[PDB]
Amino acid sequence: IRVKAIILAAGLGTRLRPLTENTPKALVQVNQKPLIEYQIEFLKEKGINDIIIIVGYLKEQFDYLKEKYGVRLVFNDKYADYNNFYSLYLVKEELANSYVIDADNYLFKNMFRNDLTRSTYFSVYREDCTNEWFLVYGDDYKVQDIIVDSKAGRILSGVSFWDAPTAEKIVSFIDKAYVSGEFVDLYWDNMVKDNIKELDVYVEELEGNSIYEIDSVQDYRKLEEILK
Amino acid sequence: IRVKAIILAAGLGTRLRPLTENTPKALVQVNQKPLIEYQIEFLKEKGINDIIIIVGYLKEQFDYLKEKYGVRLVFNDKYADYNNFYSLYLVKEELANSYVIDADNYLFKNMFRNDLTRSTYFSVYREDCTNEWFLVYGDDYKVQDIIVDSKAGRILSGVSFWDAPTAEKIVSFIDKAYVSGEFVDLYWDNMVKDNIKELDVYVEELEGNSIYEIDSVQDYRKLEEILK
Amino acid sequence: IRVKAIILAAGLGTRLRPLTENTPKALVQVNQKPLIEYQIEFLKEKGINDIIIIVGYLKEQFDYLKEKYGVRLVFNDKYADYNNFYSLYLVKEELANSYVIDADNYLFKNMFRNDLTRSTYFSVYREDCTNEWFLVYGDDYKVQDIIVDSKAGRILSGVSFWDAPTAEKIVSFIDKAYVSGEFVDLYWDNMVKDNIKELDVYVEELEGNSIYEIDSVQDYRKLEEILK
Amino acid sequence: IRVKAIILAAGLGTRLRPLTENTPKALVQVNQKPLIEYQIEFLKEKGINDIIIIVGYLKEQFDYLKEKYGVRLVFNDKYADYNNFYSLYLVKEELANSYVIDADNYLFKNMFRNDLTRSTYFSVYREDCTNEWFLVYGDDYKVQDIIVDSKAGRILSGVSFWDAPTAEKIVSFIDKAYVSGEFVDLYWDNMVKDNIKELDVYVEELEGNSIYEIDSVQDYRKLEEILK
């Protein structure tokens, strides 16, 4: 009944070079501070101190967080071999009642809560139009579908929460998926998207400047100015 | 009698995620330069300016090529429906005396030529042992067979040329194929390999670091260093 | 106190060629039925028999409507010289308590009513992202702003109603505009968008398949399938 | 110095439904014979064998002509996106000393000649009065002007021949036009009509039953009887 946080931070983050040439993405800094720190401090300040960080590319640079925040680091040796599906596979049983977080995000405000009662997707609305995973939901905010597409709307923004019963249904797809031998290129998120029919997930529309994703030096350049 | 180039680049490139989530594999860059640019600039330098690029997945990202190199982009709306047999089908009439290229390859050296006089496959030798399409030829370099298999040897490496008489035989197979009703999974190469007996094709043994394919983030990791 | 309709239909419809070289867009047919007929029959069925159609390009092809529906056609001789600002100027006095309709739109449902009491824009939400005129409004549905831009949102969809007091303020802008000497490229809609601050306009969100615009032969192709 | 022909046959011919539902316009048949066959055979019998057919809508139904008459087919992928300006753009290099033909015309007689020495328009006289493009020429038959209008006179009838120098002047407009960004709606003929001042084109008055156009099920119904 205690809420923990899983942070996916193993990737190479090649789209951000030269910035990530000798620095993992998660530890890239804005307003003179590492990206992963903002989320760790927001998670702790909200009483979520059970924090597991999946590492890989340049993992030695994370070691100091154990001492500083008391985070549990976990090594994915296949961080360049597979996609983050495997990273989550590694801690596939800690999913229940835990937050899953894409480390490459800048959080403007702390939207975390240990009172969460159901599987949630913390969705921001992209007025523009880029290729993302889009959430298809009604007035009950229950997620009807997830669709990859290029357009505008509410997307999977890199922060979610999975309750025990749903997590259980998910882990069962992870096993089959893994044993299938076909998951290399799969995002852990494919488990939900391709099985959304069997799961009950809800959206939590965020607003204003909240979760800014940095997938390229240009974004880093934008968020830079937004912070002006 | 003018040599033209057809570049296949409409695929999802899923085996390259996350690198290819918001960037076509064809446009992924090595040494701050899109893959497709090395090939186009190589083609041009050798006098081949009649370039037709088939696009689909994230097509909008190719638009700047038109203005920059004077290329022609063609949209395959079934790019996620069918294998690249359909991509070639769309331009099946521009085959004769044209090069056909797999855009997801890195070329170390410009092995192109507008003087080519016969159907050629620029094959590389794979000393290791992976599963590919192996070229079976004698001392005349005339292709005797093409066999899918896991081993070492000379392989279809993503670059070839087709003369008018050969293209004609091919395009006739493409038609029956199309009208057959079944061609979803066929690579356009299934046209040759499955009728190699009726065609006259020659091999052009490449050597050293010539054509480097990136079908996975590891290869992309490798190639990086090779260029160290 | 009687509701009348004003249908703009004088345009060249060049973006629909060849479909429109010998037929006005307003008369192009979907399901063996001219576009303008769907609107007129909907307007009539809800008691709006006071219909005024401005025509120009290929005007002679509208003449049968007079006999068939009892509509009044008004000839805009500058239909190729000026944008529809002038088309409405012609009938700027019949504005009060009347619908203003862009003829080049298909209507899936009859959203016309003779009980309207305030100025309304019947809007559709565009999930994709094209360049249009966007409606900026609150929870009162009172229009706060109208912006030209390319994105998603609620857009002016070619159907609106204007009440006496609002029509009065608008007609006063038309006059000044006309006598200003510059109005060649102005949509009649410019009168509202550029004085939205002095006017009280409300939105009436439309849902589902309601108002489909055919501004190109592709759309005409789409709408085709939609009705599959 | 060899004369070739370019037949434009990519459009959708919607105005001809139901006749063109599962048949391209060029392959709608009169006297159990496809329209494009009459023009191909007249063109051959006069020694013009260098025939390039531009296809699109239902293109597969043309493949047989390659074997049968040895015509070269060409695929315009934007056949429903743009007007035939683009279709001609694809082969803008084969214009010089070549006939340009609108495949939706029934030829009563073979007015083709490989001896042509100057840009020509094989004009017919319409005693009636429809909206078409009219040739304004003097007694020297040199075209002074082309004007869209609704009346009687000599029109652009769907057959013409262009010489090297004129075609050279026309191709330079085609280029600026394309790079302009706006041609989406231009007929290839717009190049001639909106530049007629810079070109030397002549008229070749046809007489009696020569070229009958089928743009609608009404025309087809007429021609039917004329042949009675």
Ligand SMILES: C[N+](C)(C)CCOP(=O)([O-])OP(=O)(O)OC[C@H]1O[C@@H](n2ccc(N)nc2=O)[C@H](O)[C@@H]1O
């Ligand atoms: C498509 N989605 C919405 C499901 C997720 C989008 O993911 P993406 O395309 O931005 O790629 P990304 O690598 O930046 O994914 C974000 C998170 O996955 C992590 N990651 C990636 C690959 C890998 N083997 N292990 C990981 O832990 C990254 O470090 C990063 O923190």
Ligand SMILES: C[N+](C)(C)CCOP(=O)([O-])OP(=O)(O)OC[C@H]1O[C@@H](n2ccc(N)nc2=O)[C@H](O)[C@@H]1O
């Ligand atoms: C099996 N062979 C030897 C014939 C070739 C190997 O082909 P492959 O297995 O690497 O799969 P692949 O999808 O990468 O094929 C390479 C090229 O096909 C293109 N491609 C693929 C599918 C599709 N519908 N259209 C395409 O244009 C890709 O963009 C890529 O440039």
Ligand SMILES: C[N+](C)(C)CCOP(=O)([O-])OP(=O)(O)OC[C@H]1O[C@@H](n2ccc(N)nc2=O)[C@H](O)[C@@H]1O
């Ligand atoms: C820009 N908006 C949002 C104000 C409206 C969009 O208008 P549009 O860009 O689609 O151009 P359009 O020509 O289709 O305008 C729609 C209506 O105006 C009519 N029209 C246009 C010009 C003119 N001189 N007289 C007219 O009556 C057309 O016939 C058509 O029924």
Ligand SMILES: C[N+](C)(C)CCOP(=O)([O-])OP(=O)(O)OC[C@H]1O[C@@H](n2ccc(N)nc2=O)[C@H](O)[C@@H]1O
């Ligand atoms: C206005 N003119 C005089 C310039 C030509 C008249 O042209 P039209 O109004 O009869 O329309 P149309 O679609 O029949 O044009 C005739 C020829 O263009 C071809 N066509 C049309 C659209 C397109 N993208 N490519 C084409 O090649 C048609 O197949 C047809 O054979």
Ligand SMILES: [Mg+2]
């Ligand atoms: Mg990311």
Ligand SMILES: [Mg+2]
């Ligand atoms: Mg490949």
Ligand SMILES: [Mg+2]
């Ligand atoms: Mg319109």
Ligand SMILES: [Mg+2]
């Ligand atoms: Mg015609």
